Amino acid sequence: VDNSRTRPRVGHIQFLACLPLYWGLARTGTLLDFELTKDTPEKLSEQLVRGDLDIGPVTLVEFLKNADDLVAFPDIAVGCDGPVMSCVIVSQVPLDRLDGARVALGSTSRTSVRLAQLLLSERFGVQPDYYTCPPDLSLMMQEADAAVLIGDAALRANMIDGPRYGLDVHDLGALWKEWTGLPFVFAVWAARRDYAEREPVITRKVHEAFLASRNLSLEEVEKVAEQAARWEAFDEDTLAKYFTTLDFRFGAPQLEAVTEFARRVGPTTGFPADVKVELLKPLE
Amino acid sequence: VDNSRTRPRVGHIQFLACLPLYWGLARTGTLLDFELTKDTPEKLSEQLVRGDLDIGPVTLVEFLKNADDLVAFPDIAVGCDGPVMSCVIVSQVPLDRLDGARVALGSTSRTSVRLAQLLLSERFGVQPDYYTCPPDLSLMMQEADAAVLIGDAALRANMIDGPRYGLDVHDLGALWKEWTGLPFVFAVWAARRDYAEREPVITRKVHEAFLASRNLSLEEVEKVAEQAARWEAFDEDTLAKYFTTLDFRFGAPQLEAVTEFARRVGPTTGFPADVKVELLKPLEHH
Lengths: 284, 286
Ligand SMILES: C=C(O[C@@H]1C=C(C(=O)O)C=C[C@H]1O)C(=O)O
Ligand SMILES: C=C(O[C@@H]1C=C(C(=O)O)C=C[C@H]1O)C(=O)O
Description:
The structure is a homodimer.
Chain A: E1 9-13, H1 19-27, E2 35-39, H2 41-50, E3 55-59, H3 60-65, E4 70-80, E5 87-91, E6 102-106, H4 111-124, E7 129-133, H5 137-143, E8 146-150, H6 151-165, E9 168-171, H7 172-180, E10 184-192, H8 193-198, H9 200-219, H10 221-229, H11 236-245, H12 252-265
Parallel strand pairs in A: 1-2, 6-7, 6-8
Antiparallel strand pairs in A: 3-10, 4-10, 5-8, 5-9
Residues 13, 15, 17, 41, 59, 78, 84, 86-87, 109-112, 150-151, 186-187 of chain A line the site of one copy of the ligand C=C(O[C@@H]1C=C(C(=O)O)C=C[C@H]1O)C(=O)O.
């Protein structure tokens, strides 16, 4: 019987937001210590929660709903301080005209949808008739007055589709910053608690490899954008701006934002307003 | 509509035999120009043939059965010149006692099983009662006199299980070399013909990236083995020996071996004995 140690099963978001990180994981050879799974953020969160992955990215709302069973990695996340560029509301009308109007939500999102609902309700005071559908701006603009998008589709609406067709594109990160002054965190990295307790060293090494790969990707952001631009409708300058506008930090100022967002949406989303976020503790 | 160009869909064998190549694809950043799929060699061959992949590894028999629709990459393959270490016959008896005996074959193989049958029949003159079962050396040795294994399971039988339990392990690469003097090629890399003709430059760039990634993996074989040993029952020295015993070349001497193997098995395996292997042509420069 082969009872040798097994690589951690690690998730990775397929969107452009984590393409630089994938570059870093490959350049550092870290990928060869992982058994990697690429998918959308809602699927990767489902897999980690049910046990098909050991470590991976988790959209913030789903982490908070499972905070007792997950331990978040410090100092890396998918966030913003101001505009995030790839989490948007695309609207054919001013936001204050969306009361009772139909608004399409993308099923790939869990956190951005709730943030958009929080802003429209508590900041702008409109209660749209929401419905969820696959991310497809052209279809959404035919059936609804506004749509919430994330990932490459939102980035495409922001940088290309919106300007071409004269559609308003509201940046969810900017709207939150205007409303609260705070940065925002859309996804964190976490280990299953049972895996973190069974394999403390592998969990710590995976954490440190993510930080090393993240740091390298920010040093080589221009290389990453030049290569990625060859496969996208976005050009090199647009990708480099996107990669540098994203905020991958996860320290005290970012946890402050998570705390307040959880407090405002918890009682209407399925977790306590004062939910505890457990961070992976470093070695003494 | 997003009509931008799309990355080639590229397969990659999950076995240890192609782990150094995976290291090179990652270190060179080539992976970020691929949409990669990792799987077993028989699944990756099915996907490429049916159109779920554009470029990828193909076990030799399946390539030969689809040679009209595939274009093989020159100068890279999975092969040997002598022992391959990870394609074996594990037997409790001398091979010449296998006539009418039970021999278990692993369904993960297409080329190694036919090579083992060719050797047992045409070199040793025995006609075993073959049957297929999942790769499980302990189970196979309980129900049969011999078993054919590939991949990590065969390497495990060769380096660990065989010596521990006193079982003979015959290297299919060595047996072929003894019989013919020739090296052997178990798998090649190929593009779908329709993809190669639709995207000639992406195809060429994928080919060149594989050669660059292969070259780097042989330069850094010790690094690769040291890292991989932490996740395997094999130690660093065993993996480094394995990675350097494998032969990743695919030039004239290796095509000579493919030609002769195809001639001996073609008419009983599903392709002409003189099947034509089309290689990706290099660009002429004026
Ligand atoms: C920055 C982004 O935020 C995303 C928003 C998420 C959500 O709303 O559930 C999930 C993953 C994040 O990557 C993006 O998708 O580009
Ligand atoms: C070198 C090897 O040869 C393998 C043999 C093949 C087959 O028999 O179908 C397929 C892929 C090769 O990787 C190995 O198993 O490691």
